[PDB]
Design an enzyme around this catalytic site. Sequence first.
Site, PDB file in Angstrom:
ATOM      1  N   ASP A 103       0.826  -1.213   0.000  1.00 47.93           N
ATOM      2  CA  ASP A 103       0.000   0.000   0.000  1.00 47.93           C
ATOM      3  C   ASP A 103       0.876   1.287   0.000  1.00 47.93           C
ATOM      4  O   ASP A 103       2.118   1.218  -0.124  1.00 47.93           O
ATOM      5  CB  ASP A 103      -1.052  -0.045   1.124  1.00 47.93           C
ATOM      6  CG  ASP A 103      -0.462   0.113   2.519  1.00 47.93           C
ATOM      7  OD1 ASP A 103       0.775   0.230   2.663  1.00 47.93           O
ATOM      8  OD2 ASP A 103      -1.255   0.134   3.485  1.00 47.93           O
ATOM      9  N   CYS A 123       3.311  -3.250   3.958  1.00 46.16           N
ATOM     10  CA  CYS A 123       2.460  -2.134   4.370  1.00 46.16           C
ATOM     11  C   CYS A 123       3.081  -1.488   5.598  1.00 46.16           C
ATOM     12  O   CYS A 123       4.254  -1.721   5.876  1.00 46.16           O
ATOM     13  CB  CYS A 123       1.011  -2.578   4.601  1.00 46.16           C
ATOM     14  SG  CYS A 123       0.798  -3.711   5.993  1.00 46.16           S
ATOM     15  N   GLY A 124       2.333  -0.660   6.328  1.00 40.76           N
ATOM     16  CA  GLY A 124       2.936  -0.030   7.488  1.00 40.76           C
ATOM     17  C   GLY A 124       3.491  -1.030   8.494  1.00 40.76           C
ATOM     18  O   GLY A 124       4.624  -0.851   9.002  1.00 40.76           O
ATOM     19  N   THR A 125       2.690  -2.040   8.838  1.00 44.03           N
ATOM     20  CA  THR A 125       3.080  -3.027   9.858  1.00 44.03           C
ATOM     21  C   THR A 125       3.316  -4.441   9.317  1.00 44.03           C
ATOM     22  O   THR A 125       3.903  -5.294  10.030  1.00 44.03           O
ATOM     23  CB  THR A 125       1.968  -3.213  10.932  1.00 44.03           C
ATOM     24  OG1 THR A 125       0.765  -3.565  10.254  1.00 44.03           O
ATOM     25  CG2 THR A 125       1.759  -1.930  11.755  1.00 44.03           C
ATOM     26  N   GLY A 126       2.835  -4.684   8.102  1.00 42.58           N
ATOM     27  CA  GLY A 126       2.791  -6.024   7.528  1.00 42.58           C
ATOM     28  C   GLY A 126       1.592  -6.859   7.989  1.00 42.58           C
ATOM     29  O   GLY A 126       1.414  -7.969   7.510  1.00 42.58           O
ATOM     30  N   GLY A 167      -1.983  -6.130   8.048  1.00 42.27           N
ATOM     31  CA  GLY A 167      -3.219  -6.044   7.278  1.00 42.27           C
ATOM     32  C   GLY A 167      -3.106  -6.892   6.026  1.00 42.27           C
ATOM     33  O   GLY A 167      -4.012  -7.618   5.709  1.00 42.27           O
ATOM     34  N   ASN A 199       5.467 -24.010   7.576  1.00 45.51           N
ATOM     35  CA  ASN A 199       4.124 -23.566   7.167  1.00 45.51           C
ATOM     36  C   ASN A 199       3.821 -23.586   5.665  1.00 45.51           C
ATOM     37  O   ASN A 199       2.676 -23.389   5.265  1.00 45.51           O
ATOM     38  CB  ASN A 199       3.853 -22.175   7.738  1.00 45.51           C
ATOM     39  CG  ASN A 199       3.931 -22.159   9.253  1.00 45.51           C
ATOM     40  OD1 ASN A 199       4.837 -21.552   9.841  1.00 45.51           O
ATOM     41  ND2 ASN A 199       3.007 -22.863   9.891  1.00 45.51           N
ATOM     42  N   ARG A 238       7.139   0.516   8.564  1.00 51.50           N
ATOM     43  CA  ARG A 238       7.244   1.425   9.706  1.00 51.50           C
ATOM     44  C   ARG A 238       7.795   0.753  10.966  1.00 51.50           C
ATOM     45  O   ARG A 238       8.004   1.411  11.996  1.00 51.50           O
ATOM     46  CB  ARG A 238       5.874   2.039   9.999  1.00 51.50           C
ATOM     47  CG  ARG A 238       5.382   2.926   8.853  1.00 51.50           C
ATOM     48  CD  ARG A 238       3.882   3.262   8.962  1.00 51.50           C
ATOM     49  NE  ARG A 238       3.503   4.223   7.926  1.00 51.50           N
ATOM     50  CZ  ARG A 238       2.299   4.783   7.789  1.00 51.50           C
ATOM     51  NH1 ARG A 238       1.312   4.499   8.621  1.00 51.50           N
ATOM     52  NH2 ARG A 238       2.093   5.648   6.803  1.00 51.50           N
ATOM     53  N   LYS A 242       0.244 -30.996   9.035  1.00 52.06           N
ATOM     54  CA  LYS A 242      -0.375 -29.859   9.709  1.00 52.06           C
ATOM     55  C   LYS A 242      -0.918 -28.894   8.662  1.00 52.06           C
ATOM     56  O   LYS A 242      -2.011 -28.366   8.816  1.00 52.06           O
ATOM     57  CB  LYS A 242       0.624 -29.175  10.648  1.00 52.06           C
TER      58      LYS A 242
END
EC number: 5.3.1.-
Lengths: 160, 160
Positions: B13, B73-76, B78, B107, B117, B145
């Site tokens: 974003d 994104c800002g934090t990863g 979203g 995973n 950020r 799993k």
Amino acid sequence: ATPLPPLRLAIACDDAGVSYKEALKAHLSDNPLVSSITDVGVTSTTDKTAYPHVAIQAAQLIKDGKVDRALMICGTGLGVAISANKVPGIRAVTAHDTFSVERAILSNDAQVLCFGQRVIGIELAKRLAGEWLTYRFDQKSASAQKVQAISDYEKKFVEV
Amino acid sequence: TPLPPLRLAIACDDAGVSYKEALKAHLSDNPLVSSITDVGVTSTTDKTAYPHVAIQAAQLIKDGKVDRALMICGTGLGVAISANKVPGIRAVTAHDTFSVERAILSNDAQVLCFGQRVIGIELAKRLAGEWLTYRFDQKSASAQKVQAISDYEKKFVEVN
């Protein structure tokens, strides 16, 4: 006593998250922002029940209105977050810093917070979990419109 | 190269643009990357919400067009939540070398997300580099799993 309403919590872990689970549970039992803790398990490191089962079970408690949020611990925090995100209406994050933990609530309205016991230290985990409780999402915010796009996508699917 | 190169999608974003440009430049020189498909955004002016870009990139993986996606994104958080809503896609926010390794080897997560950020650019570059060097073993215990998550996802059907 408490300026903010206390939250009901589920707590959960796989065999790799047992010790931080118990320390975090004790730490959070003393917090006036926590009104109850429901332990999904596992209770022991010998219990090899896989992370998806536990994560889905804890997320279902949120879906059913039995708890407000869930704190989940595994080796890295990754598997339980992936799994909880598979439940419709549930948003889950692994967040290992104070800024991400705040945004997990205020931006993402994420009901599930996940920690990696093998990745972060216990005092930092306790600190993050404590701060998490002090934020409450604003449903009328600009952030809520973005969350709505996630929900819009989830509307593509029905459980058969 | 001793390992086959991977096709990548990259997305961000407005909050992730400069790191995306830097990562794209860093990765275009990497022999483990055979192609990069940039789904945008391409300017801080573009206010397209993170879920759209995350879902578009995740769909490229679903449709067999790319192997993995890197999202910023800002934090990863979203973009990881958003990507995990797409059937058969597993996404993580991973900000340390141990978590990045486990994202693949435990995973089979096709999507890696960073918070511009929250983390520094040299650490982000180093992590994205290391990420390419791990390849999930379909015959491993971890695959059981992963299949458990896949089996849960079959309870839901796409109608729209």
